[PDB]
Design a protein around this ligand. Sequence first.
Ligand SMILES: Cc1cc(C)c(-c2ccc(C(=O)O)s2)c(C)c1
Length: 260
Amino acid sequence: KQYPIINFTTAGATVQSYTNFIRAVRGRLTTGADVRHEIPVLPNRVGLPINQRFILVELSNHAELSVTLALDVTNAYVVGYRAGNSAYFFHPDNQEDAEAITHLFTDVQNRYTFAFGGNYDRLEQLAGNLRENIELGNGPLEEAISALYYYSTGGTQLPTLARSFIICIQMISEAARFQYIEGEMRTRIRYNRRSAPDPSVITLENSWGRLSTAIQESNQGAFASPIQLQRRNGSKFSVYDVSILIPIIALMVYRCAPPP
Ligand SMILES: Cc1cc(C)c(-c2ccc(C(=O)O)s2)c(C)c1
């Protein structure tokens, strides 16, 4: 089965090539049909044809190594990847997702399913480091592509693999979900400055599902409960309404149908 493929290379990467990549990814994740308070909602998992379930991100680096990440269109999240003759999948949450991933990389010679899921809690434990201690940028991405590629012949240990997934997920999935995080990566690429995400980034990533719920359930734009987020300096602030999120969040996971 063929899914839509978006290419990115770290080789001669610019602010514009990274931006064109992330815009292409958002374009393929959304039908455009569902928009709540100006923010697009990803397709509902329920009833979604398998032929429309995934998109593929092909990543190449200066070493001319390529890996293809599979993203689930329902949550923009990485479900697995291919490196040459091997494909690797996170442990699916449920039997429906276990069945869904049998449709990815169907021609690959070797298929592997990890015992662990792709959630940050587990990936941080395998990496031996939190996201706040893992640098992001074109350099970390170049390194993550090599690490993912060389897992296929065991040239990569599990902690380095896990760190590589944390880099890829943030620079692709989280950048697609948030204009703010795309902006943080664009600043790194423009000025050639690798750095770990600050608390403003980590708390947005943490809150994505909760912000998606809060916006979609909202009393015509206003939240039932205040979501707590962090400033760059790590101080906590409360978000009561959708207006402050429209500049920040690009995509939401489907929670419920639009209100009456
Ligand atoms: C929803 C939302 C709204 C705003 C204003 C932000 C910040 C943008 C710059 C910040 C800083 O300089 O500390 S904080 C975030 C991270 C999320």
